[PDB]
């Protein structure tokens, strides 16, 4: 396990978050490798990938994600001017995160139809600091643990509805889980 924090580890970076509740362990592997384990845990946010991301990214994924409780695995990123938190969602636990959310439209990528969503979040910690802006979503009907993110397909089905992004800056796959249990083991390309 490491300390929360930010870096590059065999040529990628890592973001690694919690709230300090306890129940985590986040490991570096070799390569774009991973590994969370959690039990009881807080909020908790990690993974590896970019800084910066790219609007053409193409992603690989692939190992085992087990979560037992609220919790997703995504690719999760952000951009600036405007800021903008995104996910495009693959796989999730007892909550489906858009619940609630409007919807703005399907896109078909990689297999599955995604569902598009925007969300609001009002002044709430950012990359920046304390902000209000929006979550866009993109939340893969047909659930799955390896694959591959076509970023570009998203970003434009996005664009097309309004969603508009600004500069990025990080991208990466990450698991998250709020106040649940669970294994992941993930290696990113």
């Given at each position: 396990?490491?300390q929360p924090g930010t870096?590059?580890?065999?040529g990628?970076?890592?973001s690694?978050?919690?709230?300090?509740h306890?129940?985590?362990?986040?490991?570096?592997?070799?390569?774009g490798?991973f590994?969370?384990?959690?039990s009881?845990?807080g909020?908790?946010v990690g993974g590896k990938?970019?800084?910066?991301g790219?609007?053409?990214?193409v992603?690989?994924?692939?190992?085992?994600?087990?979560?037992?409780?609220?919790?997703?695995?995504?690719?999760?990123?952000?951009?600036?001017?405007?800021?903008?938190?995104?996910?495009?969602?693959?796989n999730?636990?007892?909550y489906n995160?858009?619940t609630?959310?409007?919807?703005?439209?399907?896109?078909?990528?990689?297999?599955?139809?995604?569902?598009?969503?925007?969300?609001?979040?009002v002044?709430?910690?950012?990359?920046?600091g304390?902000?209000?802006?929006?979550?866009?979503?993109?939340?893969?009907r047909?659930?799955?643990s390896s694959?591959?993110?076509?970023t570009?397909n998203?970003?434009?089905a996005?664009?097309q509805?309004?969603?508009?992004?600004g500069?990025?800056?990080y991208?990466?796959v990450?698991?998250?889980?709020?106040?649940?249990?669970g294994?992941?083991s993930?290696?990113?390309?």
């Amino acid at each position: 396990t490491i300390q929360p924090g930010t870096g590059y580890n065999n040529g990628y970076f890592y973001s690694y978050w919690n709230d300090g509740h306890g129940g985590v362990t986040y490991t570096n592997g070799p390569g774009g490798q991973f590994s969370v384990n959690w039990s009881n845990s807080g909020d908790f946010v990690g993974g590896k990938g970019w800084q910066p991301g790219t609007k053409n990214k193409v992603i690989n994924f692939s190992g085992s994600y087990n979560p037992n409780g609220n919790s997703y695995l995504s690719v999760y990123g952000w951009s600036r001017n405007p800021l903008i938190e995104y996910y495009i969602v693959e796989n999730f636990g007892t909550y489906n995160p858009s619940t609630g959310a409007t919807k703005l439209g399907e896109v078909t990528s990689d297999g599955s139809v995604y569902d598009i969503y925007r969300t609001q979040r009002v002044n709430q910690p950012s990359i920046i600091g304390t902000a209000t802006f929006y979550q866009y979503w993109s939340v893969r009907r047909n659930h799955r643990s390896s694959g591959s993110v076509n970023t570009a397909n998203h970003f434009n089905a996005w664009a097309q509805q309004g969603l508009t992004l600004g500069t990025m800056d990080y991208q990466i796959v990450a698991v998250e889980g709020y106040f649940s249990s669970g294994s992941a083991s993930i290696t990113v390309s």
